[PDB]
Design an enzyme around this catalytic site. Structure first.
Site, PDB file in Angstrom:
ATOM      1  N   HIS A  80       0.882  -1.184  -0.014  1.00  0.00           N
ATOM      2  CA  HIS A  80      -0.093   0.034   0.135  1.00  0.00           C
ATOM      3  C   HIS A  80       0.815   1.221  -0.180  1.00  0.00           C
ATOM      4  O   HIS A  80       0.441   2.323  -0.570  1.00  0.00           O
ATOM      5  CB  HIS A  80      -0.958   0.014   1.205  1.00  0.00           C
ATOM      6  CG  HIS A  80      -0.093   0.101   2.498  1.00  0.00           C
ATOM      7  ND1 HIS A  80       0.870  -0.498   2.985  1.00  0.00           N
ATOM      8  CD2 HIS A  80      -0.599   0.839   3.451  1.00  0.00           C
ATOM      9  CE1 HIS A  80       1.226  -0.341   4.178  1.00  0.00           C
ATOM     10  NE2 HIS A  80       0.426   0.650   4.415  1.00  0.00           N
ATOM     11  N   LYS A  85      10.292  -1.780   3.321  1.00  0.00           N
ATOM     12  CA  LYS A  85      11.322  -1.694   3.947  1.00  0.00           C
ATOM     13  C   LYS A  85      11.441  -3.205   5.085  1.00  0.00           C
ATOM     14  O   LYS A  85      10.301  -3.395   5.504  1.00  0.00           O
ATOM     15  CB  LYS A  85      11.186  -0.601   4.756  1.00  0.00           C
ATOM     16  CG  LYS A  85      12.838  -0.026   5.428  1.00  0.00           C
ATOM     17  CD  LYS A  85      13.246   0.909   4.406  1.00  0.00           C
ATOM     18  CE  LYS A  85      14.725   1.335   4.701  1.00  0.00           C
ATOM     19  NZ  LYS A  85      15.597  -0.069   5.205  1.00  0.00           N
ATOM     20  N   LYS A 121      10.933  -8.339   5.025  1.00  0.00           N
ATOM     21  CA  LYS A 121      12.027  -9.418   5.755  1.00  0.00           C
ATOM     22  C   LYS A 121      12.403 -10.262   5.027  1.00  0.00           C
ATOM     23  O   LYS A 121      11.833 -10.886   4.345  1.00  0.00           O
ATOM     24  CB  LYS A 121      11.208  -9.696   7.140  1.00  0.00           C
ATOM     25  CG  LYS A 121      12.213 -10.444   8.155  1.00  0.00           C
ATOM     26  CD  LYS A 121      13.186  -9.430   8.312  1.00  0.00           C
ATOM     27  CE  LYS A 121      14.183  -9.823   9.450  1.00  0.00           C
ATOM     28  NZ  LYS A 121      14.545 -11.180   9.222  1.00  0.00           N
TER      29      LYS A 121
END
Lengths: 496, 496, 496
Positions: A80, A85, A121
């Site tokens: 979104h 990150k 991740k």
């Protein structure tokens, strides 16, 4: 001890169940009430799971000349907001479920501190202790290539970050590999990764970022009389003790910044033992003693504390070590008034429920552990800007401040009649030191403090608006879910 | 009533005829005088017409399952500065000539306020009242796709904007469509459109942008004694009345900001009637009364005014409604000292010529209606920067201000001898409120005010330099033409 | 019944163990023997696992207005040859392990028929029977978008294909979505997918591709006297019977092409029953009877056969239905001389070991089921060429053939003395029919037959070179592994 995946799923489910009633009511579009209810349920269902998970299997050539197949994973939870990150972890214990859970946690953490990143991740299933520097570099570069080819690394797509097991040299390798092969024609190639060294486009103040964020999150709730009354305390940092679990970078910097503002530390524990001194422990003494001895055991200015570090008779408990250390085994024995989670998921849901009864404040890692993320956002912005902060404004603002002081001086002499009388041209010693040593890290720390204060106020407002008590974790998760839902709803989901 | 195309053509022709003599003289290159004259004529001929006009015919599927062919147009007037900027209008009355004229008007408006955009304008020939939300979204996304494929939408190529008939949800649809299909690999994909909601990368303070710009443009000429003398007035906002035509967003915000600074409103008219109260009308009362009643008729604190709203015995007339309402039919009857055109082209050339005789000031829409364009430029810059304004500087400047106050306090006690005597550490109530509520909208409004002041001074200088009277429209058009000619001449035109 | 993943792993392990000794010996570079052994082991270890597996979770909006989260996977086994190729399966039973195994199988199948594609496989975890056409199209387009963003769909990256559960309309949706959003600027956008309808860039002859490939693979080994001796048969198709399991497209076309060349069918079985007629069954009668009745039961020209279709007293068994139907439960009872596997993995390893003892020939699906892959390669080439085969050569070759016949006629009359004597200008009826009905499908079928013959000869050569008996599966896997190893070794693996 439930796994982090189930923990995150439960936190999200509770937050969504609490926030759904308000999410429905605030909708003012041309449909029916039940259509609004179904739409809110549907957007929550969309938000909950990870969008993309990539499993990798790439070869490297060992130093001796053998070949090894390396397994790696990268999960992107939400798109979104772009880019996503998330850190990269080098460990044998990495798994798809763990990386998915941590990507979801990163998504919700970025929303709390108003950082416009999705969650991600990555994990590489190796033990770095069993590889040389050359082999580790080869692994890092091959992983970077494989991720970049599949659209899982990029300044506008996905920006990785270091972890405990990965470092600034790994980030340097990733940036160098991306900028020279795939992102060669991209002006923002070096923005593909954060946590870089200074000479590689890193930002000043990243080292103490998480510790400073922990300190700011602690002090925001410390200076809040409304919560201090229920906790039975006094506003300010006076007559307050704290202990830290694990003496890593986060714990060390949090201890240093807490000791700076008048708070005193009692004991510092790790997995190899624990020190203890009720009269005050100096962070610089701990730092250089650890730097010399390779450990904290044998400190001549303190003694051995028996039992777990989580059960000391102190005021603030700050775990900055392995996760899921707070559980029903030791939850009703901690006797720590405030718990400041500097690590990701150190408290189990049953432990949190126990602390709710005992009027024990738990500051969630969603908010407290977000200082590093904020500084990584600042570093990404600096790479996009291609200039360090304050480079074009420090001297200008210095001249403006001198002119203001001169104006005050002349006006004071002119109300009076003087030529060399009142002299309000001298900045204070602290102001003069700030002027002389003005650098990018000052701006970075100022921005971090501003972000922490804004997030703390938003969390408090959500807590009082939803009739929540000391469970700040529920309020923070509700706030993050509300922000993500707002982005999804005002953007639209399907283009078909 | 001549059409807007002929109106713009006449304005440009008059401005070019006035400015050509100076454009020739200031040229100091190695050619002859007649060669310079021909070169200036030629560059003006290049500037006058639109460069690109695209006519579109794309299908949509209706809700019931039928298909409809939608006609749309987008005109890009000038590419001397990229990207082009312009709104999208959903109306049955849209036409190629109208969109071309409005694109030219946007080109000249951007030059006046020093905004580095070319002019553009788009229109979709539908009546939005006859479509559902789903069908409107389908139309918007298909239009976005068709424009993006032909290089008519893009952050560096062409940035559309909302109109009266289109909104923040349409801009959200456009941004979502572009960022996911064509500009997926572009880091600045969400900069492809402005007017977005806050959660979609919108900017704070856009709602009151045009009203604040109108207020600033009015006050710049109000505080000018040189023009106040010819108009027979007093500097300041005291003893001044204003009326507004149409109570849309622009008129409402202009009324609110004028009432704030001491000016009083008399009457507010629309197409469904008009209110009237010579003793003062409160903008908040009008706002909430309209919000409840769906109209302005039936206000208990005022009465009905007969005749057109343009002929009230007031001081400042502010039309913010349908265009070409000032013409020879009602021009010699308005009896309004100053005309503040908050709408695009509400005065015909014959009406303007009439106002010139009667010593009536007309503030052009080229300058007065440019606040929204400036804030759209700020929003585009914010999207390019990927961070809100003041995020990294608010706390730093707050600390600097506190340090300055502390320095003054210590210096005052040290010239004296005191420890707790003079206390110049307390900011004023207004300063403290500004510090506490410091946000991005403060920076946005500050930048808008700076732009308005600079543009007003440039227009005044051009007016006195070309021996123009109260016809600020001619001065503004001359200034815009001079700026565009300078860009064209110093860049070159043909690459072949 | 072991899973397909373990089956493929075992096949690859056996093939690599057989081929490694030769792979080491043929290496003639400047290293040692043990270094060569380790290098070969290492390249095999690299080849064995899948390189990339992507797990997807994307939303769709249902017809009634509800939202559903769809789970999908795509596995790319090898990237030694680009693009990767593989089908898309819509089924609730899809899984990561299954798609990985099928991607590996596709990698090894492409090598056998010298098709320069890597292996791939995609699955979407839905039941298409529970969705409407609109919802299925939405799912397909969203899946295409998500795959294209992550570099898993593209003409030069990864070319999907239909399966039993997906069709030409799904391929049309995929091609339309890719060509209009992500691959808009790519001239080869429509080469991103195969199995398209004719009007969308599909190729002629795709419908009967797999059946024709099965027929060619059968006839290549039928016309081989060296294997016919061990099987105790006669060269040719005379006095030969065959039965088919499942009457899908593959089984129907294989039956038709076998009946064409003089072979007779006995019985046709499915999951809803089985027909039986020892005197011969007509494929066109079966085709139109099934087209009318929706099933094969109730055929007036044949009777019911009890027991499984795999145990009929016939010569050639052709399973074209559900997989793993040949196992120890029914392996020693089949009494079928030749097994022609038209389906993917219909024989378990234990069953194959049983057939080895009983002198039963098993033609692997690696070779026999590769006709569709070859025709998909031809379709991809046609899309790259932007023209159908024979468009520029049919009339030219027709003129050349007429000129050759005329030359023969004139030379025959001129050796003689005649003007209208010998007339060798008349092509045969079959040749004239071929000339009149010359189309792209003739070229496609010719290329398919050439590929099948070359692959059969290579498999036979490998079988005799490695002292293998009737286990053609081991020979085919050895051949594929050798080809893949050659590509890997002569290219290099790590760029770091």
């Amino acid at each position: 001890d439930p796994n982090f995946f189930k923990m995150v799923e439960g936190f999200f489910d509770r937050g969504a169940s609490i926030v759904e009633d308000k999410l429905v009511e605030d909708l003012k579009t041309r449909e029916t009430e039940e259509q609004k209810r179904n739409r809110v349920r549907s957007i929550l269902r969309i938000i909950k799971p990870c969008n993309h998970v990539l499993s990798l299997s790439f070869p490297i050539r060992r130093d001796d000349g053998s070949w090894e197949v390396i397994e790696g994973y990268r999960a992107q939870h939400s798109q979104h907001r772009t880019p996503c990150k998330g850190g990269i972890r080098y460990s044998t214990d990495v798994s798809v479920d763990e990386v998915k859970a941590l990507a979801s946690l990163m998504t919700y953490k970025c929303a709390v501190v108003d950082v416009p990143f999705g969650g991600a991740k990555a994990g590489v299933k190796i033990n770095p202790k069993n590889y040389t520097d050359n082999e580790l570099e080869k692994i890092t570069r091959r992983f970077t290539m494989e991720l970049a080819k599949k659209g899982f690394i990029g300044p506008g797509v996905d920006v990785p970050a270091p972890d405990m097991s990965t470092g600034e040299r790994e980030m340097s390798w990733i940036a160098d590999t991306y900028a020279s092969t795939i992102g060669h024609y991209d002006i923002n190639a070096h923005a593909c990764v954060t946590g870089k060294p200074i000479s590689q486009g890193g930002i000043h103040g990243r080292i103490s970022a998480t510790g400073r964020g922990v300190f700011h999150g602690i002090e925001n709730f410390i200076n809040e009389a409304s919560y201090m009354s229920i906790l039975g305390m006094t506003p300010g940092f006076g007559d307050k003790t704290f202990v830290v679990q694990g003496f890593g970078n986060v714990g060390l910097h949090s201890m240093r910044y807490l000791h700076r503002f008048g708070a005193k530390c009692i004991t510092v524990g790790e997995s190899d033992g624990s020190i203890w001194n009720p009269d005050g422990i100096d962070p610089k003494e701990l730092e250089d003693f650890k730097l010399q001895h390779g450990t904290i055991l044998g400190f001549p200015k303190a003694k051995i504390y028996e039992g777990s570090i989580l059960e000391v008779d102190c005021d603030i408990l700050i775990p900055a070590a392995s996760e899921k250390q707070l559980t029903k085994s030791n939850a009703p024995r901690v006797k720590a008034k405030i718990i400041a989670e500097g690590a990701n998921g150190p408290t189990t849901p049953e432990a949190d429920k126990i602390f709710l009864e005992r009027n024990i404040m738990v500051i969630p890692d969603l908010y407290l552990n977000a200082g590093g993320v904020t500084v990584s956002y600042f570093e990404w912005l600096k790479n996009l800007n291609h200039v360090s902060y304050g480079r074009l404004t420090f001297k200008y603002e210095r001249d403006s401040n001198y002119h203001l002081l001169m104006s005050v001086q002349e006006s004071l002499e002119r109300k009076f009649g003087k030529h060399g009388g009142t002299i309000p041209i001298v900045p204070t010693a602290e102001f003069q030191d700030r002027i002389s040593g003005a650098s990018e890290k000052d701006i970075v720390h100022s921005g971090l403090a501003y972000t922490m204060e804004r997030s703390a106020r938003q969390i408090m407002r959500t807590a009082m608006k939803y009739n929540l008590g000391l469970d700040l974790r529920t309020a923070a998760y509700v706030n993050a879910i509300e922000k993500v839902f707002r982005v999804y709803n005002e953007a639209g989901v399907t283009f078909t």
